[PDB]
Amino acid sequence: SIPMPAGVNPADLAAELAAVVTESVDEDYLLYECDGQWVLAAGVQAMVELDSDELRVIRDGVTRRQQWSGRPGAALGEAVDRLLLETDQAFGWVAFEFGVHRYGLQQRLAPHTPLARVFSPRTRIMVSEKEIRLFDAGIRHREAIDRLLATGVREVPQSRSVDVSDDPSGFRRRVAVAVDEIAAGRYHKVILSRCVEVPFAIDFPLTYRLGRRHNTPVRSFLLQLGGIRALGYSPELVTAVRADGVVITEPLAGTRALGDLESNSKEIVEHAISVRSSLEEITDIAEPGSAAVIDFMTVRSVQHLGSTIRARLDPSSDRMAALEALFPAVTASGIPKAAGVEAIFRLDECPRGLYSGAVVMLSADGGLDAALTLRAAYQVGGRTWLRAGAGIIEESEPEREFEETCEKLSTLTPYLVAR
Numbered sequence: 001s002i003p004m005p006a007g008v009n010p011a012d013l014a015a016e017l018a019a020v021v022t023e024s025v026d027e028d029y030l031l032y033e034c035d036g037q038w039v040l041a042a043g044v045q046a047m048v049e050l051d052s053d054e055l056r057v058i059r060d061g062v063t064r065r066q067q068w069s070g071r072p073g074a075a076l077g078e079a080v081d082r083l084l085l086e087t088d089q090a091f092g093w094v095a096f097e098f099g100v101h102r103y104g105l106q107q108r109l110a111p112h113t114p115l116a117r118v119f120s121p122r123t124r125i126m127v128s129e130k131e132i133r134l135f136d137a138g139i140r141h142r143e144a145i146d147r148l149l150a151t152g153v154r155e156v157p158q159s160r161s162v163d164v165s166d167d168p169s170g171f172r173r174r175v176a177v178a179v180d181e182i183a184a185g186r187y188h189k190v191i192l193s194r195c196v197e198v199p200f201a202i203d204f205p206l207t208y209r210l211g212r213r214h215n216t217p218v219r220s221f222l223l224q225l226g227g228i229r230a231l232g233y234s235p236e237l238v239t240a241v242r243a244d245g246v247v248i249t250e251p252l253a254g255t256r257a258l259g260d261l262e263s264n265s266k267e268i269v270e271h272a273i274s275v276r277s278s279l280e281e282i283t284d285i286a287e288p289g290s291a292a293v294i295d296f297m298t299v300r301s302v303q304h305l306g307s308t309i310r311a312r313l314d315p316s317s318d319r320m321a322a323l324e325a326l327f328p329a330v331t332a333s334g335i336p337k338a339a340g341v342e343a344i345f346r347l348d349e350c351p352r353g354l355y356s357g358a359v360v361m362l363s364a365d366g367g368l369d370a371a372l373t374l375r376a377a378y379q380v381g382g383r384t385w386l387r388a389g390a391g392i393i394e395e396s397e398p399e400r401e402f403e404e405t406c407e408k409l410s411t412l413t414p415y416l417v418a419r
Contacts, residue, residue: 001134003130004132008152009153010127011208011209017031021042021141021145022224024144030121030221030222031208032219034219039126041089042122042137045119046119047117047119048076054112057079072116076116080320084362084363087120088363089361090118090119090120091121091359092116093373094357097352098115098323098328099341100328103338105345109351110351119225123138154206159415164196164409169195171401175397182394188336189340189391190344191392192344192347193349193352193387194388194389194405195349196386198377198385200384201418202384202418203417204231204379208222211415215411217234217235220232221359229378230354232376234254234257236257237371241313245314246313247286247312249311249326250309251274251277254331254372254374255304266393275307277335278326282325285311285321285322287313287315352387356372356373356374357372358370374387375408386412390404390405
């Protein structure tokens with residue numbers, strides 16, 4: 001537990017710790033901000049990689065490859081439990097496609113489709129306004145820290161800007177297809193998204209730093225995990241399983257990122273429907289008659305409308321089954337919902353993996369924290385990109401909807417800090 005350098009910013013320090021502890025070895029990590037603390041999950045001890053076709057578990061070099069069966073939630077939950085046999089915490093992410101088995105569409109998935117990535121770290125480093133607390137940092141890690149503390153944080157260099165004016169994934173066309181199916185009665189809402197590719201490469205922690213000062217979110221992350229970098233300001237708690245069995249879900253999580261009771265009556269309609277279907281979903285997973293909506297349509301700094309749902313797990317269900325049962329999020333797929341997910345397969349670039357999935361932290365005490373994530377930046381190999389969507393309804397218009405996503409994109413776009 002060390003004091004903070006004074007006039008040095010927690011996020012900046014935390015993002016600079018990720019860079020140093022990485023250039024040091026060649027370590028994967030997950031920087032995670034939460035209500036006011038950052039956590040850096042530093043090393044990799046073990047990794048669970050759940051794909052569409054296989055389970056892989058990777059330890060001290062060797063991979064263990066295996067087939068798995070129904071409900072991805074159970075296959076993952078078992079792997080995660082073995083991971084936490086001898087460690088407290090795990091971190092990773094779960095893909096949109098994780099919720100796809102439920103509505104029977106796993107077949108539509110290409111042979112190696114990421115479903116989830118979970119790992120136990122070699123080090124947790126908590127970073128806050130008053131202090132830095134270190135859990136299980138060996139010599140290698142603390143020298144890095146002492147080294148960053150010797151120098152200070154780098155200055156953020158000039159940011160470079162992307163031109164989100166054009167398509168050409170044909171978000172325009174695709175929205176108009178969605179509007180047509182909504183008019184035919186196929187479903188009532190779907191969320192379509194749009195990728196903007198970034199020519200120059202991002203330096204991630206440095207792009208994360210700049211964007212963090214210019215955005216101000218509820219949760220934020222930065223990672224380097226599979227062969228994937230990601231960075232976001234959009235995450236919100238959707239689902240949490242407490243150590244004592246109680247499940248919390250947050251049915252309107254993501255309306256915040258997704259943006260007279262006569263006007264906002266669409267919003268109230270969608271609020272009710274989405275509340276109701278999640279109460280339906282959670283019940284399929286809970287002690288009979290333990291499910292309740294405890295806070296309902298209350299104005300919960302930004303103001304998105306809110307509801308909280310509470311349940312008790314079982315005897316017989318897993319925390320990951322809770323997640324699945326509630327995945328994917330109503331607000332990031334559509335309503336009816338099955339119809340939205342299936343619409344997304346037809347009308348959006350697929351797989352989404354991570355865009356509309358999310359973060360996920362787990363505890364050996366039995367806890368789970370999962371946070372839907374939308375707007376983020378991603379890098380896999382040579383392509384770096386942004387992804388943002390909008391919710392398309394009966395009265396939606398290609399143009400307005402497109403400029404909608406333009407506005408959502410520039411909470412990232414001017415902050416792009418090149419390598």
